[PDB]
């Protein structure tokens, strides 16, 4: 019953519109708890879950200062990459960063991550061992050499194996009621004639937390990988998620089909049938 | 809680 802490950073240059915009959000599992937006009036890290509102004024001041420093480095980094790739100050560009840690059910470190992207594509990433880097192209290899020379890898690892685990523990305790819940999916199936020969069967999963879930179709017990549409898991907005999988079936053969739902909240997998 | 901004210039 592992858990996760993740921060997501987005820095975007706006040629023609002042400084870049810097945004960051922090999550525990699939629950967001903090946000920063340099466009907002606060100029402060702000709470987005009730169990972080406990944190005192020094936490908020310290998080704001680390965000302000991160943003200045992202600003410089947008300029450097522009030069690396012979781009112009007239173009808008995007730097994205994700890092965080996973802990087992005992609260102990399982794994850590840090990955950086430029204009929606991998730029540099910390490898699983938290000791070495993968550079996506020749520009990023320049960054790799710099980062090795200052032992950035150990710098991230110390955070990921240490402060990250410790904060994740504290937040799980302080928000124990809501973060330690597993809401199983409420499921049903709809049926929509397309033709007089075809109908859409749609298998629905609602109200589930956390978001991870698998919805598979079978035909006569054989996995149906053939006209199986499948939308992106989506938020309900109340802290739960929704997903559906649909297949097109020959009218009259609706009963040859089953929908199988696998979720963490389900003692064993559900099988649904149109009947 | 955030990592410390540092050692991350490209």
């Amino acid at each position, epitope marked *: 019953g592992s858990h996760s802490m993740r921060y997501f950073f987005t820095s975007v240059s706006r040629p023609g519109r002042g400084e870049p915009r810097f945004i960051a959000v922090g999550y525990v599992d699939d629950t967001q708890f903090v946000r920063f937006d340099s466009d907002a009036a606060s100029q402060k890290m702000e709470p987005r879950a009730p169990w972080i509102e406990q944190e005192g004024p020094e936490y908020w001041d310290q998080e704001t*200062r680390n965000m302000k420093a991160h943003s200045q480095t992202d600003r410089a980094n947008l300029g450097t990459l522009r030069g690396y790739y012979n781009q112009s100050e007239d173009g808008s560009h995007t730097i994205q960063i994700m890092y965080g840690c996973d802990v087992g059910p005992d609260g102990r470190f399982l794994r850590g991550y840090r990955q950086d992207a430029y204009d929606g594509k991998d730029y540099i990433a910390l490898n699983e061992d938290l000791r070495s880097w993968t550079a996506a192209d020749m520009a990023a290899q320049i960054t790799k050499r710099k980062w090795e020379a200052v032992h950035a890898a150990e710098q991230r690892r110390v955070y990921l194996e240490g402060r990250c685990v410790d904060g994740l523990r504290r937040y799980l305790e302080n928000g124990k009621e809501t973060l330690q819940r597993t809401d199983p999916p409420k499921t049903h199936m709809t049926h929509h004639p397309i033709s007089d020969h075809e109908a859409t069967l749609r298998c629905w999963a609602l109200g589930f937390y956390p978001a991870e879930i698998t919805l598979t179709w079978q035909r006569d017990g054989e996995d149906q990988t053939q006209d199986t549409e499948l939308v992106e898991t989506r938020p309900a907005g109340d802290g739960t998620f929704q997903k559906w999988a649909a297949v097109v079936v020959p009218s009259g053969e609706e009963q040859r089909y089953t929908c199988h739902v696998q979720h963490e909240g389900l003692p064993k997998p559900l099988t649904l049938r149109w009947e | 809680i955030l990592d*410390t*901004a540092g050692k991350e210039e490209y």
Partner: T-cell receptor
Amino acid sequence: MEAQVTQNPRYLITVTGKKLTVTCSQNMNHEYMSWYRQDPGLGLRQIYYSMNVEVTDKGDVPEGYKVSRKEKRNFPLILESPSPNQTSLYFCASSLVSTPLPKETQYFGPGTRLLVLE
Amino acid sequence: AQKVTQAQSSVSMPVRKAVTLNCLYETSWWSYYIFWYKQLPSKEMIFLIRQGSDEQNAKSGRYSVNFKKAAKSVALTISALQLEDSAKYFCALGDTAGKSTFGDGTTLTVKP
């Protein structure tokens, strides 16, 4: 390549209200630099610190002081209008990153003895 | 509040023995470091060691920290005292973003 933080001046006697600047520099490409003042018998009180180029933050006793951080090498301490109670021993410190690893060092300059007099 | 307390203003111990310099702190910070510094009679300041709030007891050469987090107590112990260890020793607290708070220090005289 010998690591060191340099402060200039190391000793200064000055008259109240005459603007002055104490320079601090390091050639190790360190991100983190900090200013402190130590009154006799006491510990170091943080004045301003800089996590990197163009990033500054107030310490506990910023009043009557300003800093800037236009480049990694330099972190000057500016006293717009020195007063007698700014008489103190001033230290500039630097480290490669703002929260050093176990094996990394916090470097200190030699100190600046500032005396502000009528 | 934010206060670091070194309650012994001064301490003396014979050469070749060990000494423990106490440091207690109050802070609402829950992620932090503790720094120990040595100030020579010349007033030169020197970093000795830092203790992480999530780490085991820091140790380096003749220095070791007895980090007692629930008690907010981080005593520094110096073993095998030398005359060169006579100096004023400072205990300091720092956050995750470069801020720091100093105690007012403890003067150590090693007696030959």
